[PDB]
């Protein structure tokens, strides 16, 4: 809610710091004809965003 | 003196790190508005009244 740019509704905060995004916050889901499908973003086995 | 800084890369990587539009907007009431897509959309900073 802080670092999302103002165009997408966020506050557009600029961070001069070290903030980790929990992986549980990088999950979404969408509904199509075959039902509901869930997506992540970090395919690579890296740390939290 | 010109604009001695640029935040294009910063905002690009901020959207990329938050999971893009799909990842960001799962946190919002956007899917409750039932807009087919985010392309032809605009905010209104101040209400008409």
């Amino acid at each position: 809610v802080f670092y999302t740019p103002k165009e997408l509704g966020g506050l557009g905060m600029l961070s001069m710091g070290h903030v980790l995004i929990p992986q549980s916050d990088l999950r979404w889901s969408k509904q199509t004809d075959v039902g509901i499908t869930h997506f992540r973003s970090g395919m690579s086995h890296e740390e939290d965003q | 003196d010109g604009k001695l800084w640029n935040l294009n890369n910063y905002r690009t990587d901020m959207i990329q790190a938050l999971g893009g539009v799909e990842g960001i907007l799962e946190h919002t009431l956007f899917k409750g508005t039932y807009f087919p897509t985010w392309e032809g959309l605009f905010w209104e900073k101040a209400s008409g009244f």
């Binding site: 961070s15 710091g17 070290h18 903030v19 980790l20 | 640029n6 890369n9």
Partner: peptide
């Protein structure tokens, strides 16, 4: 996961400040 802005004194000091800039 807390979302608290942690100080980067000694954190992310490996990279230069010219990285990720064009």
């Amino acid at each position: 996961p807390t979302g608290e802005v942690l100080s980067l004194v000694g954190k992310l000091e490996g990279t230069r400040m010219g990285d990720k800039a064009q």
